[PDB]
Amino acid sequence: AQNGKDLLIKLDLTGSGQFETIAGLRATRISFNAETVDVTSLESQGGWRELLGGAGVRSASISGAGVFKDADTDERARQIFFDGEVPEFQVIIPDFGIVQGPFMITSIDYAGSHNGEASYELAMASAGALSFTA
Amino acid sequence: AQNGKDLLIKLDLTGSGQFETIAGLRATRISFNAETVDVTSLESQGGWRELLGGAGVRSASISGAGVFKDADTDERARQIFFDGEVPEFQVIIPDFGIVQGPFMITSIDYAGSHNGEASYELAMASAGALSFTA
Amino acid sequence: AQNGKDLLIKLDLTGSGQFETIAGLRATRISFNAETVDVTSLESQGGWRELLGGAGVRSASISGAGVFKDADTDERARQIFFDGEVPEFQVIIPDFGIVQGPFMITSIDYAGSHNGEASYELAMASAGALSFTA
Amino acid sequence: AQNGKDLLIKLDLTGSGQFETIAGLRATRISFNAETVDVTSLESQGGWRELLGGAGVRSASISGAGVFKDADTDERARQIFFDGEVPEFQVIIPDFGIVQGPFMITSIDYAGSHNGEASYELAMASAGALSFTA
Amino acid sequence: AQNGKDLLIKLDLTGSGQFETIAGLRATRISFNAETVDVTSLESQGGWRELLGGAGVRSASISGAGVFKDADTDERARQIFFDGEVPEFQVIIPDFGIVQGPFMITSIDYAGSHNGEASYELAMASAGALSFTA
Amino acid sequence: AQNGKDLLIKLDLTGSGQFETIAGLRATRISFNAETVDVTSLESQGGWRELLGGAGVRSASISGAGVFKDADTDERARQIFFDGEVPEFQVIIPDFGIVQGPFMITSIDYAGSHNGEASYELAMASAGALSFTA
Amino acid sequence: SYAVAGALQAAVYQQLRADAVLAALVGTAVYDAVPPGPLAGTYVSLGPEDVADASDKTGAGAVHDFVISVITDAAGFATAKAAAAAVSDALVGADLVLSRGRLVGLWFLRAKARRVEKADMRRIDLVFRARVEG
Amino acid sequence: SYAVAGALQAAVYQQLRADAVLAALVGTAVYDAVPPGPLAGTYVSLGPEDVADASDKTGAGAVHDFVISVITDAAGFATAKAAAAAVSDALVGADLVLSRGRLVGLWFLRAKARRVEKADMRRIDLVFRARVEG
Amino acid sequence: SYAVAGALQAAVYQQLRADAVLAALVGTAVYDAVPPGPLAGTYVSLGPEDVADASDKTGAGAVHDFVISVITDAAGFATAKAAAAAVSDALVGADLVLSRGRLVGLWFLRAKARRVEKADMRRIDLVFRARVEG
Amino acid sequence: SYAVAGALQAAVYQQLRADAVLAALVGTAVYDAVPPGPLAGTYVSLGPEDVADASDKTGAGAVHDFVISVITDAAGFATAKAAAAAVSDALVGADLVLSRGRLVGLWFLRAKARRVEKADMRRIDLVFRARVEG
Amino acid sequence: SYAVAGALQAAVYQQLRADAVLAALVGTAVYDAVPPGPLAGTYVSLGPEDVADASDKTGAGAVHDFVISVITDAAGFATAKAAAAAVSDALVGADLVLSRGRLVGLWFLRAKARRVEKADMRRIDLVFRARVEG
Amino acid sequence: SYAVAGALQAAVYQQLRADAVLAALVGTAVYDAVPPGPLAGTYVSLGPEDVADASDKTGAGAVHDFVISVITDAAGFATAKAAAAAVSDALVGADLVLSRGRLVGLWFLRAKARRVEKADMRRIDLVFRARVEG
């Protein structure tokens, strides 16, 4: 198996090939989807649903959360939301490797209570072609 | 990291640059959103969904809650709801800074039980351009 | 702060300015809403959603619950439902004050089990102009 | 207050004025509803939603549940469902009194496990004019 | 009352009047429904919703679950799903009796974990006229 | 009964008849469905809903989850998603047997926290005719 | 305790020693304060209450889970189970009258029944719930 | 206890000592009250009940999690496990007849099995659930 | 404790010994520190508090579940239940004035009532909740 | 216990003392009943079971969380951890054969490992789950 | 402990004995190690911590629920409640400086306050939460 | 234990006594087995593990919440907190190598820190979680 701490998401500080992990990041989830575009004819094998595969639109979504630590990289995610950009984000899988895809920054939400930490969640969605450098 | 008590939301008492935090405020959440407007052509990189970014409408919502403490600032939120106004609210992030945006006052709800405190929740939504003074 | 027991809802017994609190009333919630009517043009400040405020329809809902105590005021809420009326209800906020609005009586539901009390919930909705006597 | 055991629902065995409580009946809920038909003009009191009241359709629903005890009255509810009838049901409120309304028998569901009792839930809905004999 | 173990559901092995209970069957629920077809005129008794009863379509659904025990009767439910049939199923109520209705086999799902049993849930729906032999 | 560990799902490494179980696989669920296509006439047996059975489209879905173990077979599921394929998957039921159907790879999501393992869930859907070799 | 429990014990003591059975099984040996003498050896005892405050806006009530233990020195303790069969039917469905306030129902709860001291005495507790109203 | 438990112990004692096995393993040594003498040393014991009141509107029932312990002085305690194998098959699926009221099912629950005093006696508890009806 | 609890005990002690009843039942025997002498034997005692910190952004409050026990040496303990009936009505709905800060409500909670030492003393605890504000 | 556990201990004892390792670490010192003599001092012990009744309509099964402890008198207890490494690999994935009934899987659970008496003996418990079928 | 707690106790000790109040109530008697002598009798004590590890990908933090007890030998214990009123206002809203790492907030939690040994000493615990950052 | 824990303790012992700090604070006094002599008095101790079996279909793993306690005889216990600051930074983010199997991560958990025997020794436990793989 692989460690959960080694599965990170990270930003573009300068915007051109400069990657730093964000902050207090208690949880990450790169999450893939496919739109399962159905093609079932009048005859299909006895009544089973037949699917095509490669014609479906496919995507990815990143849901990060953790404690509010003001870094050079936490303020960078603010500037993506107010000035709408699609920078090259990067989610590293412990042993798979770098994904290196353009995501938008769909939902950011800073939260805080009278007795606890300052936290933030951080939702994303895909915006282009992903990769896999292995 | 930063304290959760230093993450506050605050009102316009006089309406012109006078800011006081509301009340017993047990929880805050400034929460941002983006409408992820899709532009995927017939050819797109192998089938991945492509997004545009800056064309999407973006917003913010504030969800505050806490105990009912009658202040000069708790009664001010009542007068915004009955006489519908969009004053310059302000959510301070411990180390990021002042947001200073016009919000409306979409949902206010005072609640109370036979054995506990008098509480209120307080939902908002964006109404204009936000800012970030850092 | 203020006590939760002092936050009451109350009826019209005679129908003309006679107010008695209902019954065993374990929980109350006056709950306000606004319909957030959007007006965003082609140019708006960098892409933020702009709202108008006072054009939205606004309302209130009362959700009361507690034990079934047959009073002069518990049977009064029955007669509002079967003979559909909109009497001047009244929700008192410990230190804010009397709301004094016409509500309808949308949902009443008496419940009981083989081992516990006789309880009822009681939902309402707005029907006219509210007030605030402070 | 009033006891929860005295709040009963009961059947028509013969169909003509013969009332027996059903079975093991662990929970009852007579539950009323109103469809809140909106009439808000272009001017209404400052922007509050105005309602009419008596024009709305109103109803009632009974949700009973308990252990499966085969009585003369448990088998009677089976014959209402298979041969669709609207008999005069009756829900007695400990101190309010008899409701005496025609309900249909919308959902009956007998359930059982390998280690527990034989249970049933029993949902209803209104079918005509209710009453209140006080 | 009646035992929960005596409330069984059972198959057609040969297809012609041969009934065996399925498997490890931890939970059963025969569950009835009625579509409550509304007929409310312009005048109806003071505003109550009036219903017709016998014109509504009525049905039944069986939700069984338990441990995966390979019997002659567990493999029979597989052959109904792949070769779509509507055999005469049978749900026995401890003291009511045999229902004897044609159900389809809408959802079967075998599940298993690394530390527990092999389980299955099994959902059905009605397909014809039920019965009641008492 | 049968063991839960013997209920496995497995891949096509080479793509042509080469089957290896995936990874740390804490939970599996092959889950079948049928679309219950209704044919009820004006007369049907007293008002019961009648169904046809074999005309309905039927399918299957696989939901696997477990710890992220980088194997030859965990990276194989990545290459199915990015290059959209429908390989011959295989779910073995402890005593029923091999299912051997083409599934697509609808949702893959790798997740990780600061204090726990690296995990993944893995959702599928049917894409063709299944089988049953017993 | 709350205000009622002074009279609740005085009512559930006076409901005992007027029940016809247990005047022939226990005798006069129903007491909170055990009188001095030779200790008869099949007595019951009514002291260890506990309150739970089921209250409201208007007034107050309480939930008394008072314990009535049955002690026996007999060889077996089918003597105590026959004595607590006489306890419980005297109290469930009480219709008691109190000196201060009302009770609305007297149900039954847990009844542990074990061997207490030196495997010689046999004590069987009986927890009864009394929802009262002050 | 409730009214049934006086006869429930008298029925689960009489179901024992008529079971053919455990008349050859334990012998006549089935008792609540242990008779004076030399203490045979492979006895069973049937006293520590507890009740849970599964009741309803109409009548009352109970859930008895009565404990039947098996004691042995043997070196190992495959003697007690062979004796409680003879206990449990005599009681699960009971079809007992009571003296007051009915039971609907006699299931099985937890069965702790440890070393009790001075690592010499070996006691294995058996908790059986008896859902009865008064 | 928090800052208020020094004055909360001084206020709930001074609300006692000015209540007219319990000056005739207990007498002057209301004390935290039991004075030296012959130990009167029907005293009450007000020490074992515990705090829960119901606070906010602006200021701080607390929840004090302070325990007021009533001890008696009488034969029965209808003496203590009559004394704690005089305790509780003096405190629920307090309207106390503090020396440092405010309290908003003084409710009631659990009140265990058992036999303490050597089955001779009879102590009945009374847990009262005091939501205060610093 | 249920009917299987007499043969479950006899099977998990016979799977031990045929495992090749732990015949070289513990030796012949695998026993429930400790034989008289000098107490070798690195023994294991297999008695404290507990059952959980995983049953169904058709037949019955059980879940045995039986405890196999490893005791050592050595200075450290890397001796016991090396001995329970030899315990656990002999049992997880058992493929045992029973004398009465079947087991479907033998997993692993909690394994506490502390210092027991006078900081001299070192006992490491091993809880194994055995889902069996009667 | 984690790396910070060596300096957290050294900071919450140095914040005490510089607070102006409690230098006049307790005196110099603030210590973890109680110095030898006559035991003054109104001391406070700061040792029993416990940590909870609120960490992340980038770095680590901790949550310290350290206990500061106040002991008094006085007759009543309004002396200790006045002393812990001086403890708590010195620590909530701390703005401390550490020697290794940072703390972000010092809140308040539970504060039990009972009689400890022989009803003579009066100890009131104060649990404070310190969310720190390493 | 599972198969790994024999080598997990041997790895977290060898990671200690090679850490440069705590060779200057504790010295050579890192041991499971305390060697005979005069008992130095600032030792640490590494024995009380417990396992939780995080396993899968393919292979097996485990979760070891092993406890490393730090004992001191010093007057205060800023000595032990400085010693466990040296414990914890040597283990969190371990990158250890085992003798049998792998570990994927060594996190931190609860760390109680109280006074143990006669208020003289000061022991601070440190629970570390080790997710391993067999």
Measured CA to CA, the distance from residue F6 to residue E118 in angstroms comes to 9
Q: Which of G6, G33, G52 sits opposite I82 (nearest CB)?
A: G6
SS3 call for D75: helix
Q: Are F126 and F101 in contact (CB under 8 A)?
A: yes
- Which residues on chain J are in Cβ contact (under 8 Å) with F5? 93, 105
Please name the amino acid found at residue G11.
A
Residues from chain A that touch L131, judged by Cβ atoms under 8 A, are 1
Using CA atoms, how far residue J121 sits from I90, J41, J70, J79, in Å, is 59, 9, 10, 12
**Any long-range contacts for D16-19 (C-beta under 8 Å, 24+ apart)?**
D19/D90
Eight-class DSSP state of C79: H
Q: Are K119 and I69 in contact (CB under 8 A)?
A: no
- If you search the block for the tokens 């009333």, which residue do you land on? C25
CA dihedral of K115, K117, K120, K125, whole degrees rounded to 10: -40
How many residues are present in chain B? Answer: 134
DSSP state of A30: E
Contact of B23 with B78, CB cutoff 8 Å: no
- How far is CA C108 from each of CA C13, C88, D9, D59, E44, rounded to the nearest angstrom? 17, 17, 17, 11, 21
User: Using what technique was this structure determined?
Assistant: cryo-EM
CA distance E91 to chain C (A): 29
**Tokens representing A59?**
């995507």
Q: Looking at this protein, which amino acid is placed at residue B126?
A: S
| Residues of chain B with C-beta less than 8 angstroms from the C-beta of C51 | 86, 104, 125-128
**Residue of K12, K34, K45, K51 for testing the chain L interface, max L β-carbons within 10 Å:** K51
What is the Cα–Cα distance from F46 to E58, expressed in whole angstroms?
Answer: 9
Instruction: Please tell me which chains touch G, using 3 or more CB pairs under 8 Å as the contact test.
Output: B, C, D, H, I
Supply K82's token pair.
């006045």
Grouping H, G, I as helix, E, B as strand and the rest as coil, residue D82 is helix
* K10, K33, K53 member nearest L109 (Cβ): K53
Which residues make beta-bridge pairs with L69?
A: L45
As given in the structure block, the two tokens for residue D16 are 């003509």
Chain F hits for E89, CB-CB cut-off 8 Å, are none
Containing H/E element for D74? helix D74-82
Q: How far apart are CA L18 and CA L16, in angstroms?
A: 5
Distance (Å, rounded) from C-alpha A45 to C-alpha E80? 16
B97 DSSP 8-state letter = E
Q: Is any Cβ of chain B less than 8 angstroms from the Cβ of I107?
A: yes
Alpha carbon distance B117, I106 (integer Å) = 11
Q: Do H110 and J52 touch (CB under 8 A)?
A: yes
In this structure, what token pair is assigned to residue C9? 């809802």
Q: Closest by alpha carbon to E106, among D82, F38, F124?
A: F38
Within 8 A by CB and 6+ apart from H95, the residues are none
CA angle H10, H13, H18 (to 5 degrees): 125
Nearest residue to D27 via CA among D58, D71, D66, D56: D66
- Return the structure tokens found at L79: 């000595």
- Residue F125's H or E segment, with its range, is strand F118-126
Q: How many CA atoms lie within 13 A of J87 on its CB side?
A: 33
Chain A residues within 8 Å of chain C (Cβ atoms):
82-84
Under DSSP, the state recorded for G80 is H
Alpha helix (H) ranges present in A64-129?
A: 74-82
From residue H31, give the alpha-carbon distance in Å to each of F6, H10, H36, H46. 46, 11, 12, 7
All residues of chain D having their beta carbon less than 8 Å from the beta carbon of residue H131 are: 116-117
Q: Residue H133: name the closest of H95, H98, H102 by CA.
A: H102
* Angle between the N-to-C axes of helices J78-88 and L5-15, in degrees from 0 to 180, rounded to the nearest 10: 150
DSSP letter (8 states) at residue C96:
T
Amino acid identity, residue H21?
V
Pairing of strands B8-10, B88-93: antiparallel
CB neighbour burial string for L113-125, b if at least 16 within 10 angstroms, e if fewer: beeeeeeeebbbb
Question: Across the strands, what pairs with F91?
Answer: F9
Q: Which residue of E has its CA nearest to D109?
A: E31
Contacts for L127 with CB less than 8 Å, ≥ 6 apart? L65, L66, L67, L108, L109, L110, L111
Which residues of chain I lie closer than 8 angstroms to G9, CB-CB? Answer: 78, 81
Chains in contact with K via at least 3 Cβ–Cβ pairs below 8 Å: A, B, F, I, L
CB contact under 8 A, I57 and A115: no
The second-level CATH assignment, the architecture, of K4-133 is 2-Layer Sandwich (3.30)
Question: In this structure, is the dihedral angle defined by the CA atoms of residues L14, L16, L21 and L25, taken in order, positive or negative?
Answer: negative
CA neighbours closer than 13 Å in the CB half-sphere of residue E87: 24
Q: How far apart are CA B112 and CA B116, in angstroms?
A: 7
Map tokens 């009822």 to a residue. Answer: C120
L120/L77 Cα distance (integer angstroms): 10
Rounded to the nearest angstrom, the gap between the alpha carbon of residue L133 and the centroid of all alpha carbons in its chain is 19
Please indicate if any CB of chain A lies within 8 Å of the CB of K100. Answer: no
Distance CA D123, CA F17 (A): 53
How many residues are present in chain D?
Answer: 134
Rounded-to-integer distance, Cα C35 and Cα D48, Å: 11
Residue with tokens 């049934």: H4
- DSSP per-residue codes, L49-117: EEE-----SSS-EEEEEEE-EEEE-SSSSHHHHHHHHHHHTTTSS-----SSSEEEEE----EEEEE-S
Q: Breaks in chain L follow which residues, C to N over 2.5 Å?
A: none
Collapsed DSSP state (helix, strand, coil) of residue A91: strand
Beta carbons of H42 and H34 less than 8 angstroms apart: no
Residue of I19, I70, I81 to mutate for G, most G C-beta atoms under 10 A: I81
> At how many Å resolution was this determined?
3.5
Say yes or no for a CB contact (<8 Å) between F117 and L104. Answer: yes
3-state secondary structure of J54: coil
Calpha distance E63→A22 (Å, rounded): 47
Six token digits for residue G77:
């303790």
H/E stretch holding G83:
helix G78-88
Q: How far is the alpha carbon of L79 from chain A, nearest alpha carbon, in Å? A: 29
Distance from CA of G76 to the nearest CA of D (A): 30
- The single residue listed with the structure tokens 């002999």 is J90
- For residue B95, the distance in angstroms to the closest alpha carbon of chain F comes to 23
| Touch criterion met for K and C (3+ Cβ pairs within 8 Å) | no
The C-alpha of I45 sits at a distance from chain G's nearest C-alpha, in angstroms, of 15
**CA nearest neighbour of F91 among F22, F34, F41, F1:** F22
Please tell me the distance from the alpha carbon of residue F116 to that of residue F67, in angstroms, as a whole number: 10
Contact L88 K3 (CB under 8 A): yes
To the nearest whole Å, the CA of D23 is away from the closest chain H CA by: 6
- Give me J122's structure tokens: 């070192």
Please state, in angstroms and rounded to a whole number, the distance separating the CA atoms of residues D108 and D79. 11
Give the residue from J106, D69, J64, G110 showing the smallest Cα distance to H108. J64
**CA distance linking residue H4 with residue H51, whole number of Å:** 10
All residues of chain B having their beta carbon less than 8 Å from the beta carbon of residue G57 are: 114
